[PDB]
């Protein structure tokens, strides 16, 4: 039938002015474009087939050709930006938006998917899809009393497409579009399907990746407790974006950070900071570093949840990128913490792993650590214990790392480092 047609034969069938011949040829094109390996997208574009496919989207009396052309165009739009542009340039956006109202679920679903690929290209096409009025009919498809009545594949495609409308920066999505989408997104974030939850979390992570005003729009919707819950999911594809969203939120105000703490996030961190997935440990440690950049009462919560030993652990042994986040977490802690909090940090064993990292060939982490040490010495001065600290550092071999850093190429490193030796070691 329609298996392995040449593009030439597809063109012949499409040019026939016989709707059924055109349907067979469009199906043949769909099969080429859906094959496992190397779909001939550029060949199909070069043959001038896009305008015909777009015209077929409007064939209400022939729902099969609407479906086949929708699938063909979805796959062309799944390619490079130039390939996606060819689909947009053919007038596909409003044609697909019209198909959202199709009585045929499999057709409206394909239109949802195609619009997701187009919006996924970047901010410009995202915003163009929004200008053509895609949001109202997309949200209308989810306006049911219980999401569980929808087919799960259908619901997953809608959630994914909505997440692409929330994605990308420079610019971020229109504020009014975000407000319009948020209530449905919150509902999806409470739906019990792992893929819907993952893509909902991804969407929330995009919406919180920005200025405090953007974070506030999300936090105000009361989603933090649900994010904290999903943070404890067993599925890594859910934990990953849930953690990114939580991490994003704590880059915000002290008050936004406090919502995360109030929701119980810190109790999940012993497991996150020891997670066998390197990326999870790194993101969790980055998150901790922004929490220890917070108020003294928020640092105290980190202490009370027993998280300081976990930071000592990550500093002692982790992927180097994670160790650098831990170094940051410590410098922030020592910068904002009380004397008592800083004393507690040393008692937990921070000094030796801090000193061991001074042999890293990374200027930034060296600067960060020297800052922490300086901060810890300033606390020692207030207790008159600079000598005890001076001894701890010498004993673990930290002093002849600091001494050697006096000859380092970077100005801050050699400078801070010189300062430390005269000041506490001379």
């Amino acid at each position: 039938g329609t298996v392995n047609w040449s593009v030439e034969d597809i063109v012949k069938g499409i040019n026939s002015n016989n709707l059924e011949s055109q349907l067979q040829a469009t199906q043949a094109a769909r099969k080429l474009l859906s094959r496992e390996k190397q779909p001939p997208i550029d060949n199909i574009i070069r043959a001038g087939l896009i305008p015909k496919f777009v015209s077929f989207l409007g064939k209400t009396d022939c729902s099969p050709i609407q479906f086949e052309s929708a699938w063909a165009l979805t796959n062309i739009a799944s390619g490079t930006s130039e390939q996606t542009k060819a689909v947009v340039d053919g007038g596909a956006i409003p044609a697909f938006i019209s198909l959202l109202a199709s009585p045929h679920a499999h057709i409206s679903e394909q239109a949802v998917w195609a619009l997701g690929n187009i919006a996924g290209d970047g901010s410009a096409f995202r915003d163009l899809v929004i200008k053509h009025g895609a949001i109202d009919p997309l949200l209308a498809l989810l306006a049911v009393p219980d999401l569980s009545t929808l087919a799960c594949g259908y619901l997953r495609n809608l959630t994914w497409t909505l997440s692409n409308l929330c994605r990308n920066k420079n610019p971020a999505p229109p504020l009014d579009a975000v407000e319009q989408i948020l209530p449905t997104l919150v509902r999806l974030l409470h739906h019990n399907d792992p893929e819907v939850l993952a893509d909902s979390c991804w969407a929330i992570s995009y919406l919180t990746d920005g200025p405090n005003e953007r974070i506030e729009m999300v936090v105000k919707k009361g989603v933090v407790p649900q994010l904290v819950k999903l943070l404890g999911a067993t599925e890594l594809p859910i934990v990953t974006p849930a953690l990114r969203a939580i991490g994003n939120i704590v880059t915000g105000t002290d008050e936004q950070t406090q919502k995360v703490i109030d929701a119980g996030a810190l109790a999940v961190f012993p497991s996150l900071l020891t997670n066998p997935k390197t990326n999870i440990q790194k993101e969790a440690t980055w998150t901790m570093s922004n929490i220890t950049a917070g108020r003294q009462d928020q640092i105290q919560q980190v202490v009370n949840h027993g998280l300081v030993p976990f930071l000592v652990g990550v500093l002692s042994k982790a992927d180097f990128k994670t160790q650098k986040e831990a170094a940051w977490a410590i410098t922030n802690y020592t910068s904002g913490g009380t004397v008592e909090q800083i004393v507690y940090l040393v008692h937990c064993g921070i000094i030796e792993p801090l000193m061991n990292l001074l042999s890293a060939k990374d200027t930034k982490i060296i600067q960060v650590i020297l800052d922490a040490i300086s901060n810890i010495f300033q606390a020692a001065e207030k207790l008159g214990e600079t000598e005890k600290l001076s001894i701890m550092i010498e004993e673990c071999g930290g002093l002849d790392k600091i001494e050697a850093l006096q000859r380092h190429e970077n100005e801050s490193v050699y400078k801070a480092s010189l300062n430390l030796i005269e000041k506490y070691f001379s």
């Binding site: 859906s34 699938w71 990746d209 994003n248 880059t251 950049a293 904002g336």
Partner: peptide, 16 residues
């Protein structure tokens, strides 16, 4: 302040 800035596919092809 001292706060610091910092796998879903962007596009999907329908196969089979």
């Amino acid at each position: 302040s001292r706060k610091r800035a910092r796998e879903q596919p962007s596009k999907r092809r329908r196969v089979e």
